[PDB]
Design a protein around this ligand. Structure first.
Ligand code: HEM
Ligand code: HEM
Ligand SMILES: [Cl-]
Ligand SMILES: [Cl-]
Ligand code: NA
Ligand code: NA
Lengths: 713, 713
């Protein structure tokens, strides 16, 4: 059946804003996963998982009699799709079980691993999500094999449909770079927001870049992709060598024996895929990656044998039985155990990407330190493994259960505890009046609070106004944030705050984070009064102020808005049209299309544009909260044309006289062009809409202000 | 950006079940359009619409000074997409304003029509939907030009995103028949559910079949497509000749001057399309269809001139200025007015498809009767126009406002008014006990009520249990309904009913329609007791019994389930796979995926399959309401394979012994294969889920029982 996407393949896709409705969710509207998880007997689940590790099923026999390596791979792939550019991917929604991730070539046979966990999932039911279970099982694997983990937090609620993630534009699985949809340009520059080298891989190609088995060049790809997943050199070496302490690869025969991935398989496969015609199709005959490597002499026990082997042998290039490039130790004895035949042993083997850890000079230094000091290795791997598997969980307030590590880590963007009484509703009213008496304008107030709160992204739950990081580096100097104007606003608010806090008894105080958001609330209320409407904007106190020392400036960089259609801002020229960037930002803010539309139209007339630009400011009462954006946009008395100077800026002229009335960008005018967005603009541009527009605007403003408030959740 | 649909283009699409969520809807959850409409000043709207008719705008000047013809075409096309096969299409959701219908070639320049209505829509706001406005406007056009309409009902609520309708598989607009995705096979057999001859047309091609100008062969396509839109020969000739009493076609120059349709146009077009480079691009120079025909000597006034011209001249084939085939009156004088130049007149002209009304022998007789008896023509057109524009509105209880016709029409599937006291809760309990004491089984009770209620489709709001049409022709003889079994159940229930009604005072009685549903509810309660659960199933009385004479047997045929996955039924072998048919039926029932899943799994164990088939009956306690379907389907101890006799039936065997445990169809096993369905099945197949399963089953059962109950809305 032909679809709208077929006829108009470049039209903007709004469905991404309307996923995850209560319609697709089987749990009641009142289901709260945190409350369910908090009563789980986590120790009981862990004992069942520990038993499972050595209870082989004949439909997917356990290598070495132990499924630990397979489950560690499973958990690492759950977490390993994460990209810092947009926060998308990661383990936090259990998306490995839906398309496309369930059927990526790098996730082959993890379908088997998830099916092994069904009995445990079935037993505990809604009290443990799949998303938490996948990570918990990797921790139990590690513990069962002698490795002490850093801890574990539950709280990843399950989702019920595929997420809409851009994984690349290639139309062929695993396509090598340089094709018509190449994700590389220039001198091997990987396009943002991607964090893998080929479509369907987690990070890199285990044979080497585009299959070329050069460990030095592979290391460049490892470094780049791991940095795009928030991991530095030490973490990367710790993770790779730690993972490949355990288990083995599978490549017993040619890959052409392997059948359809799960999404393509027949209905009788019951959700499994990659059925293999090679010998038994499983166990000793398994084919997963096509490589046939076993790294250590004790694949089911933590050890420091990965680095003993990497450094204690010289390595020769060889081929697996499927034809893939891999490496074998020169002159070695057969010291590595076979996975099924206790009378067979093998020589040590490595991947090209393992050898990167020795042949890249910066990795080599770290790897040597870890080989000489395996306790340093164990600590680094435990911390990295926790970070990897928790990186998208958000604020520490979301972490549940009895195994949460007490140590606060810088990468968590931590927020200090509040240890004093909070302001009450009368205090809030007193503060709003003091803010408005200061001479700060509606535009300044709304622009500052928007700048602070709109860094939030629901993909990894980073950002938001909690912390008052807008006053710190690097946020205070982002161009979208208008650094000089911002500094002036913050100075005036800090004086208000000092004066209010100086006059209190009993230890009551207000944080700057709270006062920024409250001051924005005062601006919106003043704008509504300017329009003739008395409204109260809700406000919830309890934010705290983070220090510079608790703020990792380099990790904060990915939160910089380079496109923010809500402020009519674009830092430079991109290949993706600005309206598509707007919808992407709306998705990160967790907004529906109605919410996006009201929010944008209100922000335009409040003065929120960067640089006081007049684009989309379709009103003659700026700083009054009215629906004028929509009424003027939809007025058929105005004709619009792209300017000769800039095709992305439009002039609105009176159709009868030619007189210039307005200017706008693509982000402004999409609301009058896209058939779904224009239907929404019509509701708000109608003669009966003024009250509705104000109420809906207040409600989406308060939603945005509260996005990171998991302390209240 | 590669999507799951690109990778697995035949996987099943569940998003169709989760459209129209509260997320994409700008109106509050509590918005009730009926209540808004009932306060509209409809008279005021009609005055404004009458004013609009001759208020020409320079960006799309009015032909003859009067927009009436354009607006009639607008309303006829709004309604004209309707198909009786599935009830999809029609005017009832205002979908002409969204993709793809906003950009179909047949709807060219109706964008202008809708834009002319923006000021009225803006002025009245939420109190008149677009969907109602489009129809009201056509009515006012007719009244303005001297035709008295049969009436009008409001109550078409607006929708907010494109609907998921199968319009065909062609990848080229207007593709002629016989291509790789032809909608025709055999002897010009149009594929169900389609009701148009080419992709992007409303019914037929005005030049003739695949562009061949043969009025006799065109008539065959007219007849078949109009029948697929619920119209017989009389209605068809009335509608065509009535419409083509008014206005004109547009084809002043070659079609190559016409630019991008609305969804393809640039953002500066602000939702309009088909911009033309031919002369002024508009008015006298307009190009819409490419034909240049004006049918009558007074195109802005009702007349009897259509049939005087059709019969009064002989016709010659000619070409418009765009090259299209059309017909001109041999030897006529220039009697037809020009739309813009008072000094030009034209000869009478006709489309191929107009000539069909004279040259097809069955239409000729009707056309002649109408030419000789113009009052019969007028009355037929008025009634057909009402039917056309109200066909998808559902029961008369949905019809709102002061212009609703009092006459009950057969095509509305009318339900008699209830004029007696209803049964109360004590009476319901007494009747449920009588039903359970009669010896009717769980399976018979559930199957009968499901058969009755599941005819409902939310596309056109036809069917459902109200009316007790399951006891009449043709429902009583449908194979899916198990006629012999059904007859036995109905006889027992009618004897219960007769006995209960015989014992009452005060006029209280129970209808058979209510008793069938209540008997179903007793079955579900008995099934829950059989499982050890104490459950009450909600029941709302108030259904009435329709007569055979109130039930048009041929119109009822399209409600026959030829595929009903909920009863594991398929009437024969189709090209569309059965799990796609299941999702389609779920959409018609208005079910979400979780609701579809719970419903099916419960019905399987209750004995609702047609013919007592064991397929999908994954329980050892049939007729008990348990989650066994899910627990057994997901048991990895069972291996599934297609049978050698039939690739659409699967055998489930114990993995270790090979012993046969179950059989199932594609509809059964999809729940264990599709990654989203299987995530839902897991919830209900968990150890903590038995009570949740039961309570969710009851809720969805009740939902289905009440789908047609707009008397309670
Ligand atoms: C450069 C990065 C990495 C590359 C290219 C890579 C490559 C692979 C490949 C090709 C396999 C074999 C799949 C099979 O045939 O079954 C695999 C297995 C495995 N990897 Fe990695 N790996 C990477 C990093 C990681 C990390 C970070 C971890 C965990 C911390 C991990 C843990 C594992 C484990 C445990 C297995 C064994 C699975 C089993 O026993 O079934 N790897 N790796
Ligand atoms: C066999 C069925 C029909 C065919 C092939 C057909 C074809 C068309 C064509 C090609 C146009 C010209 C569009 C343009 O160039 O502007 C048109 C115009 C029109 N049709 Fe039909 N028609 C059909 C049935 C209907 C029916 C059922 C109605 C209404 C009851 C209707 C009412 C109109 C009116 C009022 C116009 C004039 C539009 C204007 O004045 O702008 N037609 N028709
Ligand atoms: Cl994601
Ligand atoms: Cl529809
Ligand atoms: Na994420
Ligand atoms: Na419909």
């Amino acid at each position: 059946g032909t679809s709208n996407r077929d006829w108009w393949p470049n039209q903007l896709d709004l469905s991404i804003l309307h996923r995850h409705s209560s319609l697709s969710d089987p749990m009641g509207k009142d289901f709260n996963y945190a409350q369910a998880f908090e009563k789980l007997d986590l120790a009981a689940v862990k004992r069942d998982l520990h038993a499972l590790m050595t209870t082989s099923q004949d439909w997917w026999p356990a290598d070495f009699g132990h499924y630990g390596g397979l489950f560690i791979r499973m958990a690492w792939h759950s977490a390993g799709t994460y990209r810092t550019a947009d926060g998308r991917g990661g383990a936090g929604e259990g998306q490995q079980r839906f398309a496309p991730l369930n059927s990526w070539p790098d996730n082959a046979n993890l379908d088997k691993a998830r099916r092994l966990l069904w009995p445990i999932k079935q037993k505990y039911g809604r009290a443990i999500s799949w998303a938490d279970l996948l990570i918990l099982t990797g921790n139990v694997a590690l513990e069962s094999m002698g490795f002490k983990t850093f801890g574990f937090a539950g709280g990843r609620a399950d989702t019920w449909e595929p997420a809409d993630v851009y994984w690349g534009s290639e139309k062929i699985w695993l396509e090598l770079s340089g094709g018509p949809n190449s994700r590389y340009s220039g001198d091997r520059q990987l396009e943002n927001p991607l964090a893998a080298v080929q479509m369907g891989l987690i990070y890199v190609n285990p044979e080497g870049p585009d299959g070329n088995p050069d460990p030095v060049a592979a290391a460049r790809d490892i470094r780049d992709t791991f940095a795009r997943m928030a991991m530095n050199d030490e973490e990367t070496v710790a993770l790779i060598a730690g993972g490949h302490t355990f288990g083995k690869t599978h490549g017993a025969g040619p890959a052409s024996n392997v059948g359809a991935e799960p999404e393509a398989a027949g209905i009788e496969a019951q959700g499994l895929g990659w059925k293999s015609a090679y010998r038994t199709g499983k166990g000793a005959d398994a084919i997963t990656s096509g490589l046939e490597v076993t790294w250590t002499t004790t694949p089911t026990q933590w050890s420091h044998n990965f680095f003993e082997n990497l450094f204690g042998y010289e390595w020769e290039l060889t081929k697996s039985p499927a034809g893939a490039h891999q490496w074998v130790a020169k002159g070695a004895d057969a010291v590595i155990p076979d996975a099924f035949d206790p009378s067979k042993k093998h020589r040590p083997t490595m991947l090209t990407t393992d050898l990167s850890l020795r042949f890249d000079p910066a990795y080599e230094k770290i790897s040597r330190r870890f080989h000489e000091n395996p306790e340093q290795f164990a600590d680094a791997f435990a911390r990295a493994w926790f970070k990897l598997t928790h990186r998208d969980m958000g604020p520490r307030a979301r972490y549940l259960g009895p195994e949460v590590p007490a140590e606060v880590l810088l990468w968590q963007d931590p927020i200090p505890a509040v240890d004093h009484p909070l302001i009450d509703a009368a205090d809030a009213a007193e503060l709003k009046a003091k803010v408005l008496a200061s001479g700060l304008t509606v535009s300044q107030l709304v622009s500052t609070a928007w700048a602070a709160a709109s860094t939030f992204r629901g993909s990894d739950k980073r950002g938001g106004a909690n912390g008052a990081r807008i006053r710190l580096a690097p946020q205070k100097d982002w161009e979208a944030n208008q650094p000089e104007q911002l500094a002036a606003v913050l100075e005036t608010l800090e004086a208000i705050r000092t004066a209010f806090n100086g006059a209190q008894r009993g230890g009551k105080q207000v944080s700057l984070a709270d006062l920024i958001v409250l001051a924005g609330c005062a601006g919106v209320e003043q704008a509504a009064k300017n329009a003739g409407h008395a409204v109260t904007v809700p406000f919830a106190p309890g934010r705290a102020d983070a220090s510079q020392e608790q703020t990792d400036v380099e990790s904060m960089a990915v939160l910089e808005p380079v496109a923010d259609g809500f402020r009519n801002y674009l830092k430079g020229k991109y290949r993706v049209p600005a309206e598509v960037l707007l919808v992407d930002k709306a998705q990160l803010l967790t907004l529906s299309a109605p919410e996006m539309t009201v929010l944008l139209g209100g922000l335009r007339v409040l003065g929120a544009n960067v640089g006081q630009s007049r684009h989309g400011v379709f009103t003659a009462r700026e700083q009054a909260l009215t629906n004028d954006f929509f009424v003027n946009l939809l007025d058929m008395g105005t004709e619009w044309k792209p300017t000769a100077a800039d095709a992305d800026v439009f002039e609105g002229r009176d159709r009868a006289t030619g007189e210039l009335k307005w200017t706008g960008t693509r982000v402004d005018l999409v609301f009058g062009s896209h058939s779904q967005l224009r239907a929404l603009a019509e509701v708000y541009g109608s003669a009966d809409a003024q009250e509705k527009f104000v109420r809906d605007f207040v409600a989406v403003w308060n939603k945005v202000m509260n996005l990171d408030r998991f302390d209240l959740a």
